[PDB]
Amino acid sequence: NPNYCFAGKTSSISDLKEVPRKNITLIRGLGHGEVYEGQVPLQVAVKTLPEVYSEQDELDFLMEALIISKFNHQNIVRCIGVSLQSLPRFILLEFMAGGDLKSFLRETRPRPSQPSSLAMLDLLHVARDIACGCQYLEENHFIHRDIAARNCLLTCPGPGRVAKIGDFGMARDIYRGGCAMLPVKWMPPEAFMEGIFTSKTDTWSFGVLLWEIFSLGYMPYPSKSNQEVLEFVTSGGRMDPPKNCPGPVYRIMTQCWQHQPEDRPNFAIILERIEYCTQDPDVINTALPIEY
Ligand SMILES: C[C@H]1Oc2cc(cnc2N)-c2c(nn(C)c2C#N)CN(C)C(=O)c2ccc(F)cc21
Numbered sequence: 166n167p168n169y170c171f172a173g174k175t176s177s178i179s180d181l182k183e184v185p186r187k188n189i190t191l192i193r194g195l196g197h198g199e200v201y202e203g204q205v206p207l208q209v210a211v212k213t214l215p216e217v218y219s220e221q222d223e224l225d226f227l228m229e230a231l232i233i234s235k236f237n238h239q240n241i242v243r244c245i246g247v248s249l250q251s252l253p254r255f256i257l258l259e260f261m262a263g264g265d266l267k268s269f270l271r272e273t274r275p276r277p278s279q280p281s282s283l284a285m286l287d288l289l290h291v292a293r294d295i296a297c298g299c300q301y302l303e304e305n306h307f308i309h310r311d312i313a314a315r316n317c318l319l320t321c322p323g324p325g326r327v328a329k330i331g332d333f334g335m336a337r338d339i340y341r342g343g344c345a346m347l348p349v350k351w352m353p354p355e356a357f358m359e360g361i362f363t364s365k366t367d368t369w370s371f372g373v374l375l376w377e378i379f380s381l382g383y384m385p386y387p388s389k390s391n392q393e394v395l396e397f398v399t400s401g402g403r404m405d406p407p408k409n410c411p412g413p414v415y416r417i418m419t420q421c422w423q424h425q426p427e428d429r430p431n432f433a434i435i436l437e438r439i440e441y442c443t444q445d446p447d448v449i450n451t452a453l454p455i456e457y
Contacts, residue, residue, distance in 0.1 A: 166178040166179070166227075167224060167227070167228060167231075169228065169231040169232060169235065169340075171232070171235040171236075171305065171307065172235075172305055174235070176231055176234075176235055177231075178227055178230075178231065178249070180231070180234070181230055181231065181234060181246065181247045181249065182234075182245075182246035182247065183246065183247060183248065183249060183250060184205060184245070184246040184247065184248050184255075184257060185248070186248050186250070186251040186255075188205055189203055189204070189205055189209075189211070189248055189255065189257070190203060190204045190205075191203050191211060192204060195210065195264075196264070196265075196268075198212060198213050198214055198215055198218075198226075199213045199215070200212050200213070201213070202260065203255075203257070205245065205246075205257065207245065208260045209245050209257045209258060209259070209260050210257070210258040210259070210260045210261065211255050211256070211257060211258075212255070212256040212257075212258060213253045213254070213255055213256075214226040214253055214254040214255075215253060216252050216253050223254070224341075225334070225337055225338060226254060226256070227249070227254075228337045228340060228341075229256070229333055229334055229337045230244060230247050230256045232333045232336065232337055232340070233256075233258070233333055236301075238297075238298060238301040239297075239327070239329075240294050240295060240297045240298030240301070240327070240328065240329045240330065241298050241301065241302075241329055241330050242258050242259045242261065242318060242329045242330065242331040243258065243259040244256065244257065244258055244259075245257035245258060245259065258331070259329075261318035261319055261320055261329065261331065262319075262320065262321045262322070263318065263319025263320055263321045263322050263326050264318065264319060265314070265315055265316075265317065265318055265319075265331070266291065266314040266315070266317035266318065266319060266328060266377075266378070267313075267314035267315045267317075267377065267382050268382075269319055269322070269382075270314065270377070270378065270381045270382030271381065271382035273322070273381075274381045274382070274453075274455075274456055275453050275454070275455045275456075276455060276456065276457075277455065277457060280455055283381070283453060284449070284453065285411070285448060285449045285450070285451050285453065286443060286449045287324070287326075288378050288379055288453075289414075289439060289442055289443045289448075289449065290326075290328075290443075291317075291319075291326075291328040291378055292374075292375055292378055292439055293436065293439050293440070293443070294327055294328035294329065295312070295317055295328050295329075295330060295371070295374065296371065296432055296435050296436050296439055297436065298329060298330045299312065299330075299367055299371055299432045299435075300432035300433060300435075300436060302330075302367070303364045303367065303431060303432050306364075307336070308336065308362050308363065308364060308366055308367060309330065309333070309335070309336055309367050309370075310335040310336050310339060310362060310366065310367070310370075311332070311334070311335035311336070311348055311351065311370070312330075312351065312367050312370035312371050312373075312374055313348060313351050313370065313373065313374055313377065314374055314377040314378065314382065315332075316330060316331060316332040317329065317330055317331060317374075318330075318331035335348075339362075345391070347391075348370075349391045349394060349395055350373065350384075350385045350386055350391065350394050351369075351370040351373045351374075351385070352366070352369065352370065353365070353366055353369035353370075353398075353422075353426065354398060354399055354424060355426060356369075357395060358399070363426060364431065364432075365426035365427070365429050365431075366426075367432075368421050368426075368429045368430060368431065368432070368435070369421055369422060369426075369429065371421055371432075371435065372417070372418045372419075372420075372421025372422045373385050373404075373418075373421075373422075375414070375417060375418050375421070376404055376407055376418055379406075379407040379410045379414055380407035380408070380410075381407075381453070381454075383407070385404065386404060401424070403419060403422050404418070406418075408454045409451060409452065409453060409454050411442070411445075411447070411448040411451050413438075413441070413442045413445060413448055414442055414448065416438075417430075417435065417438050417439065417442070420438075421435070
């Protein structure tokens with residue numbers, strides 16, 4: 166069985182906390198592999214490996230458990246344990262009742278009925294949360310490679326929500342595929358052109374996540390295909406501000422999207438700038454667009 170090295174420690178599948186299958190109860194589907202709300206009474210999310218999957222699938226599923234289990238940070242989802250000695254194989258994760266960030270932004274957009282559902286400060290707190298997660302990965306020399314709203318989760322729908330990075334399947338694949346499946350809209354030039362990935366790769370992607378957040382869940386580069394985005398970005402093209410986006414927030418995006426990786430901020434600097442935004446009354450008093 167494969168080994169995994171994070172920080173100074175090497176780990177194996179034998180290190181994963183096996184939870185007896187008999188102690189695990191499935192409650193409901195969550196939006197499926199498949200994913201369930203479960204009970205161990207500890208509430209968990211159950212990520213399953215379909216039995217119809219091959220050998221590489223098994224290994225990838227396994228490696229992802231190892232990866233998540235070795236992190237220790239508040240803005241990265243916890244792994245409760247695994248159930249690998251029965252089929253289908255289970256990974257048990259911290260249950261995030263707020264669901265994924267992209268769906269949340271789209272479903273929670275301010276409306277005529279819910280004009281006050283979300284405010285600028287809520288978006289800034291989500292951004293800060295994920296940036297704090299990205300900073301922890303950066304300082305531990307881990308490159309995520311797929312920072313995006315679809316891969317972030319929320320503890321709850323309501324005001325006390327915490328955002329966390331919840332999927333590590335791309336870092337798992339490159340750790341050990343298709344072109345039309347690559348998240349090119351989240352990738353910097355050196356990444357999609359040279360296959361070069363650094364901490365500054367995640368900075369660019371975080372800039373796109375910021376745009377996702379402040380657009381309230383729109384697909385990046387509206388109406389452009391992957392190949393068109395590739396040519397656009399390579400030529401110096403960048404997204405416009407999301408509707409009603411404060412200039413200080415758009416400025417963080419455009420800094421994350423600098424062409425040269427060395428010119429882009431590390432996450433410590435990103436966090437500082439996000440914090441300054443939350444301090445500025447003109448930023449947080451800005452009204453979000455209410456779609457009719
Ligand atoms: C592996 C999975 O994890 C969880 C999913 C959910 C909650 N808590 C955890 N741990 C969840 C979702 N939607 N809803 C309504 C709930 C609930 N409650 C999203 N979902 C179906 C996913 O597959 C998914 C998407 C992105 C990501 F980063 C991790 C996951």
